[PDB]
Design a protein around this ligand. Sequence first.
Ligand SMILES: Nc1ncnc2c1ncn2[C@@H]1O[C@H](COP(=O)(O)O)[C@@H](O)[C@H]1O
Lengths: 179, 179
Amino acid sequence: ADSELQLVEQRIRSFPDFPTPGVVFRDISPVLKDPASFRAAIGLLARHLKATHGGRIDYIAGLDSRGFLFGPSLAQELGLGCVLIRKRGKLPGPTLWASYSLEYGKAELEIQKDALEPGQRVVVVDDLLATGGTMNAACELLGRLQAEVLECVSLVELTSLKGREKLAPVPFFSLLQYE
Amino acid sequence: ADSELQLVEQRIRSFPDFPTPGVVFRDISPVLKDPASFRAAIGLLARHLKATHGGRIDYIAGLDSRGFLFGPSLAQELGLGCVLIRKRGKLPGPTLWASYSLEYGKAELEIQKDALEPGQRVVVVDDLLATGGTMNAACELLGRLQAEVLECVSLVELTSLKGREKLAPVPFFSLLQYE
Ligand SMILES: Nc1ncnc2c1ncn2[C@@H]1O[C@H](COP(=O)(O)O)[C@@H](O)[C@H]1O
């Protein structure tokens, strides 16, 4: 198109009635597919994070699974490492775990007990904030390792689901908002 | 790739008997956590790919979920987009899916119907090649979209499981090898 924000915005594809009737799904797949829009997305998140924390971040925490598509590349742009927060069962060795609500049921996330040392400053990233279930669980786990969660970020936020309120006092930033 | 490769090898951590007895789990998590290791792994994959295929690659395809950690960064380094291959039920809109065999029973993968156009040339990435079942299924999905799979790559290859044979005649490159 032209601007970087509109380049990202034109590449978020809408799918009505997926996964269930009445929902409007936001697919980030086109953002990844277009190298110019992927780099526009990473650069917007990076510039936000650099301006906001002045270089003083220790790690990005990428959220299983779609957050893994952004976390490493964001971290690398910022010159940082990326740690992983995963669905239960996926990581080897001693873990901490936290439950959250998933569709009609309950699920769990986990982090390795040595993923972070105390006092490390971390930004959580995922593609999309919907109910805020996994993101909230992520914050719980990081606090348990005595990490300082600076904020959570996503490319997209679905405001009608009120996942941002669920994260307070943890600050939250999104690039784009839809219902 | 001596020094750079040692930076990767040093950060692969092994866990006996996970997830089940007699399996040595290879954990790439410390590679992601160290930005120099991550940058070395991405550079070494990119360098091999450019030295082998030059500018003939159109897209990287990342395998759900640990392939997601490397695909976008590899595609960015090459100036290419990245397309996604997911566990069934995760992608919106029209898809093609297939089933393949695992340790007792079946698993299923899928791809969006419009991920690639015919004759487009793709390299598949995952973190580790074991039996090659998953990567083989990804190759088959991509074939059904009339994509040309130039190569599959990973950080680790478990050579006693003969994943390389399963993929033939699609070439396969790994940074590190173990029995
Ligand atoms: N020993 C192992 N360590 C880590 N991941 C493994 C191991 N064996 C299999 N996998 C994973 O299982 C999938 C590969 O299985 P395969 O389809 O048998 O090649 C990939 O996602 C690998 O990352």
